[PDB]
């Protein structure tokens, strides 16, 4: 999952959330089955070479393209030719089904960063700036 | 693209004939056309500009005249050195287009071919290409058909025609049907036979010799 | 007054460069536009593109872009044009043209042009002489008072060839056409001589055939 | 390969570093020692020359 | 980093480190220009008999 | 799925010329960050008089970029006809990190029209356009410059008074001319000033409606609109992708005559982005109203440690490229722009390598096939010497369920050479895959 | 590795095909069969730079001994910067200044070297 799926970013604070609707938040619509990716792989064109693809921090599988929202059995294949621009070779995404639960069980990732300016997200919820002299302050990220 | 034609690709017309050339245009060419002179064998000569001006260095018995996609350049008489193929050239978008081209030509004489065969000869033989030439002497109407009846067998695809310029003279060519053949299908064929239609002419005609 | 010279005609390869220059005596050169227009037989005039020498920058027609070439010399005033891949197709003559307007590539009218360069594709073909295999007369190819005594021309590699008649002396029913491509691609024209048959004893007919590139002067009896 | 060279890299850039950061302390040490020396120098000359 | 791409792009995480060492080792060369200069000078001023 | 408009009801896509060699021109306007050119301003912070060395994206200094120019169409006496561009749409460049382009740095100045040079017309600021995305390919001709899922464009409007940025699905057109048609030689933009940009009623869907004449763009996640005061000052423009999105910087509403590019919009786009295009924009004027417009630089963004001075503004005008010349590594060393005066060794070339010398049958693994293969505690080896090998081609005949190689790679341990190959097999179940472990307590 | 290779006189037990030093540098055996081919470590040129603060002028002195195989803006040598660079004969390597006078030089100054004192206003060597 962590190499072919989805990787969050060593670092940022992160928390990552296994949780699942009982049967009230009926909204969530039941998908197909549980669907991964097990191998995302390229071959040259000398067929003697062969380089797996890690998913990088953050962001999409390479072979997303090429793989629709469900992959239709667990084992599946799907390769695809790449352009001469692209170096060319063989692009090959190996997919994974897993039988679905009674309750759907999902999975959140939150990666919040005290990082840029902008504003600020904060809970919501006369001691200010106007009397300045006093101790102790907390602003939009800096406290 | 912008794909012109010339409405005539071929009129005849003596000297002192008032002549109209038609050209027409794809799409609206508000006053952007060029008519331009060729007589084979050398440059073009430049007409008219903008279909309706003369360019100088012409005689005003041409004229220009049109817009929009109606164009019409005039010869008010024709003369001996009128007689050239003439192009109509779009200046309006992007690349010239030309025109077809219209040929010149006078009634000087309506002559009928006079009809001549010649088989090839003995060292023609010992060559191992055997050829008749039909020779067509002297027909003005450009129109003429010819074809081969080599022992009542239609022979096409290996017969090439030849015509020459206006003689000047009699407004007529001489035109040459050259039809070779190989030893294998000449010395098995005796009638060697040339179908000859004119307009000019009166009847289709045949030059039919039988070979040795 | 300008004058367009053109070059001579190119034989070359398939696949091969040709190079075709024409040089502008008269006139202001480098102001004006000089354009490559190209006849093919029986296609008619096509537009290849085009070029203003001050300014350097060279128009080009949509389908010859990237393998036709249009450059300009400032100090000799002469216009090239280069064509890659040549093809059966591109055979053609080329005709270097003025544009009478002091600028403006968009909007062109030809007022003075070449004399015109043929070119000619040429699958490895080498030059060599031609030869007399004539047409002589008899009495089955005299019709009437007259025959007709021919040379004929056969296999010569560059196109350019020359048949004169008694060496030149016999100009009376000279008719020559032109010569044609065989599957071959060998080069092969006629030449027939409407002699009376009272001069066919009298007279013996020797037709002089000319090859320049293969310098050859050959005469065979017809 | 990369995730693991990265670490191993690190490493070696820390190993060097720090022996370097020991080179230039004794070479500022034995550099005063010179310069103290250089001073005695400057008065045998003075004195015994 | 004995000249490899990747160990340069690891190393910039401590470039400061490479520029301490450089300027305090540049000093101390400075430094021992300085102590040569100043006891020739003492050596110097001396009326040499040839 | 936003709605953006009604689709283009027009058969065929006007015409487009490709003359490559009317845009070929030299004015090189090479970063020089002796003046700031080209610099993105820390994201949360500001500064006062102190000078830092900071570590970011920037463009390297000296580096010319790439130039860029528009143009008008064909245009006779008072009727516009084919539009004119270059090869930019073709060309396909590659998104490694960003890129920040100079817009109307010619501006203000009077220049012979690149379209007609002996036509000359003082030159005006005009605005780029791009295509950004994470696929690339050919058209049905061939041509190069198609892009296939969602893609990111970005086109000026209303005689560049506005921005769009939009995040699309784009499909060809069948019409003649049009991408997916007959007779296509490069889709383009356009917008015509005669109609479109009258005096106060800039037509603010010219420039989208010419691009959905080629395009029938489709499931576009978002839309957005920026306003874009008129006037000729050079400006700086900015893009990159993160995590978060992708960012546009401009210099426009911050630092408007300084040049310092501030973030202005950031973007829910998440895939990605490897290659972008500008898109070609041809003006479709009459020949007697040719103007001419400020050729745009574009220059790609390279992780840097930049010495930067902080004015009490806070403005940035004056950077070092502390990978320039040797200089530089003096003064970010002392992170200073004043070094004392002396002779510093700097770092040392080296040479370069050529003509990989080597010197040096058939390790078998028959063994391995023949038979049952042993207990787990029954295990056989089989150790390899004097011999050379291929492991692909033994592996490729299993399905292997595990790849685990410590302190080695999966591709070293098909490649690297050593003395001796030790491989031992047995027979085992996936259930204790758990327990076949170096670090594990089980039996 | 990346070293030069040479031909040396015959040394060692020759049954392996490494000779060692101790170190990871090593002799390296025989190329091909029945020869020897004794190994080096690549060799690297140094670089400095005079800053020469009043002028604000540059002047590239190279390594003590520098002088022959360097070249201005050389393609072999690859440095770690952005190859954007900043002759003498062989006093110490060559310089990219080239001023040959040396006149007379009074004691202050850069003095980079044993004899030259490079003063103001490049004029190297002296």
């Known amino acids: 999952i962590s190499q072919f799926n989805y990787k969050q970013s060593f670092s940022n604070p992160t928390c990552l959330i296994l949780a699942t609707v009982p049967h009230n938040l009926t909204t969530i619509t039941k998908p197909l089955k549980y669907s991964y990716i097990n191998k995302c792989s390229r071959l040259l064109s000398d067929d003697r070479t062969e380089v797996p693809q890690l998913v990088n921090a953050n962001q999409y599988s390479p072979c997303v393209s090429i793989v629709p929202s469900t992959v239709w059995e667990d084992g599946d294949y799907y390769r695809k030719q790449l352009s001469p621009l692209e170096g060319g070779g063989w692009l090959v995404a190996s997919g994974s089904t897993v039988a679905m639960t009674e309750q759907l069980q999902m999975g959140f990732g939150i990666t919040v960063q005290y990082g840029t300016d902008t504003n600020s997200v904060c809970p919501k919820l006369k001691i200010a700036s106007q009397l300045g002299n006093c101790v102790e302050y907390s602003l939009y990220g800096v406290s | 693209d912008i794909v012109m034609t010339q409405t005539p690709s071929s009129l005849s017309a003596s000297v002192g004939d008032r002549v109209t050339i038609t050209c027409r245009a794809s799409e609206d060419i508000t006053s952007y056309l060029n008519w331009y002179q060729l007589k084979p064998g050398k440059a073009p000569m430049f007409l008219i500009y903008a279909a309706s001006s003369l360019q100088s260095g012409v005689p005003s018995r041409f004229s220009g005249s049109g817009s929009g996609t109606d164009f019409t350049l005039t010869i008010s008489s024709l003369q001996p050195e009128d007689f050239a193929t003439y192009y109509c050239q779009q200046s309006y978008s992007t690349p010239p287009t030309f025109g077809g081209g219209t040929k010149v030509e006078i009634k000087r004489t309506v002559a009928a071919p006079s009809v001549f065969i010649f088989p090839p000869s003995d060292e023609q033989l010992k060559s191992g290409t055997a050829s008749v030439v039909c020779l067509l002497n002297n027909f003005y109407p450009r129109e003429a058909k010819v074809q081969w009846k080599v022992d009542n067998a239609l022979q096409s695809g290996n017969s090439q025609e030849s015509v020459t310029e206006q003689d000047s003279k009699d407004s007529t060519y001489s035109l040459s049907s050259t039809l070779t053949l190989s030893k294998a299908d000449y010395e098995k064929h005796k009638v060697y036979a040339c179908e000859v239609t004119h307009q000019g002419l009166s009847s289709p005609v045949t030059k039919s010799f039988n070979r040795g | 007054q300008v004058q367009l010279v053109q070059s001579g005609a190119e034989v070359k390869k398939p696949g091969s460069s040709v190079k075709v220059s024409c040089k502008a005596s008269?006139?202001?050169?480098?102001?004006?536009?000089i354009s490559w227009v190209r006849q093919a037989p029986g296609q008619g005039l096509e537009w290849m593109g085009g070029?203003?020498?001050?300014?350097?920058?060279?128009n080009y027609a949509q389908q010859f872009q990237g393998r036709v070439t249009i450059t300009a010399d400032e100090s000799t005033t002469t216009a090239y044009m280069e064509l890659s891949r040549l093809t059966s197709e591109d055979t053609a003559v080329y005709y270097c043209?003025?544009?009478?307007?002091?600028?403006?590539?968009?909007?062109?009218?030809?007022?003075?042009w070449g004399q015109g360069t043929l070119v000619t594709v040429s699958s490895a073909w080498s030059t060599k002489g031609p030869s007399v295999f004539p047409l002589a007369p008899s009495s089955k190819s005299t019709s009437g008072g007259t025959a007709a005594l021919g040379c004929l021309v056969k296999d010569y590699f560059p196109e350019p060839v020359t048949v004169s008649w008694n060496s030149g002396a016999l100009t009376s029913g000279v008719h020559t056409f032109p010569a044609v491509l065989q599957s071959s691609g060998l080069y092969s024209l006629s030449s027939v001589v409407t002699v009376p048959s009272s001069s066919l004893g009298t007279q013996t007919y020797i037709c002089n055939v000319n090859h320049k590139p293969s310098n050859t002067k050959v005469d065979k009896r017809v | 390969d990369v995730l693991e060279q990265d670490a191993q890299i690190d490493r070696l850039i820390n190993g060097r570093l720090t022996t370097l950061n020991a080179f230039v302390a004794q070479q500022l040490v034995r550099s005063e020692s010179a310069a103290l020396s250089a001073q005695l120098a400057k008065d045998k000359v003075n004195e015994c020359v | 980093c004995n000249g490899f791409q990747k160990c340069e792009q690891l190393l910039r995480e401590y470039g400061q480190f490479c520029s301490k060492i450089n300027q305090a080792l540049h000093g101390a060369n400075l430094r021992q220009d300085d102590s040569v200069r100043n006891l020739f000078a003492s050596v110097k001023s001396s009326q040499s008999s040839p | 799925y936003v709605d953006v408009g009604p689709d283009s009801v027009k058969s065929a896509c006007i015409e487009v010329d490709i003359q490559q060699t009317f845009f070929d021109k030299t004015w090189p306007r090479p970063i020089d960050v002796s003046k700031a050119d080209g610099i993105i301003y820390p994201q949360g912070r500001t500064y006062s008089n102190i000078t830092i060395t900071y570590q970011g994206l920037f463009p390297y200094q000296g580096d010319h970029g790439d130039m860029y120019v528009y143009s008008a169409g064909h245009a006779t006496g008072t009727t516009p006809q084919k539009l004119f561009v270059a090869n930019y749409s073709q060309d396909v460049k590659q998104f490694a990190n960003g890129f920040v382009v100079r817009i109307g740095a010619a501006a203000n100045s009077t220049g012979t029209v690149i379209i007609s040079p002996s036509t000359s017309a003082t030159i005006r600021k005009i605005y780029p356009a791009f295509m950004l995305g994470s696929s690339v390919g050919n058209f049905s001709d061939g041509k190069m410059g198609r892009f296939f899922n969602h893609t990111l464009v970005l086109l000026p409007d209303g005689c560049g008074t506005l921005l769009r940025a939009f995040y699309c699905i784009l499909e060809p057109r069948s019409g003649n001319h049009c991408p997916a048609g007959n007779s296509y030689t490069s889709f383009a933009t356009y917008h015509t000033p005669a109609t479109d940009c009258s005096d106060g009623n800039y037509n603010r869907n010219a420039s989208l409606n010419s691009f959905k004449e080629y395009f029938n763009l489709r499931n576009c996640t978002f839309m957005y609109t920026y306003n874009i005061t008129e006037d000729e000052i050079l400006e700086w423009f900015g893009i990159t992708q993160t995590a978060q999105g992708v960012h546009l910087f401009s210099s426009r509403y911050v630092d408007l005559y300084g040049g310092n590019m501030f973030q202005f919009a950031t973007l829910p786009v998440y895939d990605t982005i490897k290659y972008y295009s500008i898109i070609p924009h041809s003006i479709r004027s009459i020949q007697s109203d040719r103007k001419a417009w400020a050729a745009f630089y574009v220059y790609k963004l390279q992780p840097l440690t930049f010495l930067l001075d902080f004015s009490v503004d806070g403005y940035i005008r004056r950077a070092i490229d502390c990978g320039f010349n040797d200089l530089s590594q003096l003064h970010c060393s002392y992170e200073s722009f004043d070094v004392e005066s002396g002779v510093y060794s700097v770092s040392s070339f080296e040479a370069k390598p050529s003509g990989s010398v080597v010197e040096q049958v058939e390790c078998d693994f028959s063994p391995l096939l023949s038979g049952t293969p042993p207990q787990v505690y029954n295990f056989k080896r089989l150790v390899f010497t004097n011999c050379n090998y291929n492991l692909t081609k033994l592996l490729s005949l299993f399905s292997v369920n595990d790849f685990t190689c410590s302190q080695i790679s999966p591709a070293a341990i098909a490649s690297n050479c050593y003395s001796s190959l030790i491989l031992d097999y047995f027979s085992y179940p996936l259930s204790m895959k758990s327990d076949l472990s170096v670090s594990s307590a089980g039996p | 590795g990346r070293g030069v290779f040479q031909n040396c006189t015959a040394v060692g037990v020759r049954q392996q095909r490494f000779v060692y030093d101790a170190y990871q540098n090593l002799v390296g055996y025989y190329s091909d069969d029945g020869n020897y081919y004794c190994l080096r470590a690549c060799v690297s040129v140094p670089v400095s730079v005079i800053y020469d603060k009043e002028t604000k002028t540059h002047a590239t002195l190279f390594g003590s001994v520098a002088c022959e195989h360097i070249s201005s803006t050389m393609s072999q040598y690859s440095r770690s910067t952005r190859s954007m660079l900043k002759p003498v004969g062989c006093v110490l390597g060559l310089v990219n200044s080239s001023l040959f006078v040396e006149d007379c030089k009074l004691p202050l100054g850069q003095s980079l070297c044993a004899l030259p004192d490079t003063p103001s206003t490049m004029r190297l060597a002296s």
């Open positions: 070029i203003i020498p001050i300014f350097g920058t060279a």
């Open positions: 008269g006139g202001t050169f480098s102001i004006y536009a």
């Open positions: 043209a003025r544009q009478m307007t002091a600028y403006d590539y968009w909007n062109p009218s030809f007022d003075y």
